[PDB]
Amino acid sequence: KVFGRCELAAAMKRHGLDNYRGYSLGNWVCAAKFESNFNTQATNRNTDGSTDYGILQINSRWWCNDGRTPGSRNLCNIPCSALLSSDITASVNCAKKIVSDGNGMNAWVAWRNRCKGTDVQAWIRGCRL
Numbered sequence: 001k002v003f004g005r006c007e008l009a010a011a012m013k014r015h016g017l018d019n020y021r022g023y024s025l026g027n028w029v030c031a032a033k034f035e036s037n038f039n040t041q042a043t044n045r046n047t048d049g050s051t052d053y054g055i056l057q058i059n060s061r062w063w064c065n066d067g068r069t070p071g072s073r074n075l076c077n078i079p080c081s082a083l084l085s086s087d088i089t090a091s092v093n094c095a096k097k098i099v100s101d102g103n104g105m106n107a108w109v110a111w112r113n114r115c116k117g118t119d120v121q122a123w124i125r126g127c128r129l
């Protein structure tokens, strides 16, 4: 599914991301924009052979199992394919674990380079939330 911007904001809010670990909703929307262009089916292979999955590009190195990332962990205890569903529940639950883990949203490289310090509120402007 390709979410609309306000559509995604609403789903994220409903699933308790808004201000989770102090990150406002626009942070999460902005991260999703630049990670996946709001596409739940997005996949990208990393140089190390790990793969990033879903709306938030959660990496199989640590967070989900894909059967093909040697040495990796599955700290969200999910198949990586669950991160590609039209329903964002598994993605959000796993994101919550990731952002709690010490580096906050810096774990998302596109967040750090494209969202951090910017006017992230723009991402939820005009949404009925």
Ligand SMILES: [Cl-]
Binding pocket: 024, 025, 026, 027, 120, 121, 122, 124
């Ligand atoms: Cl915001």
Ligand SMILES: [Cl-]
Binding pocket: 065, 066, 067, 068, 069, 070, 071, 072
């Ligand atoms: Cl694996």
Ligand SMILES: [Cl-]
Binding pocket: 021, 022, 103, 104, 105
């Ligand atoms: Cl933080």
Ligand code: NA
Binding pocket: 060, 061, 062, 063, 064, 065, 066, 067, 069, 072, 073, 074
């Ligand atoms: Na893994």
Ligand SMILES: [Pt+2]
Binding pocket: 014, 015, 016, 089, 092
């Ligand atoms: Pt939820």
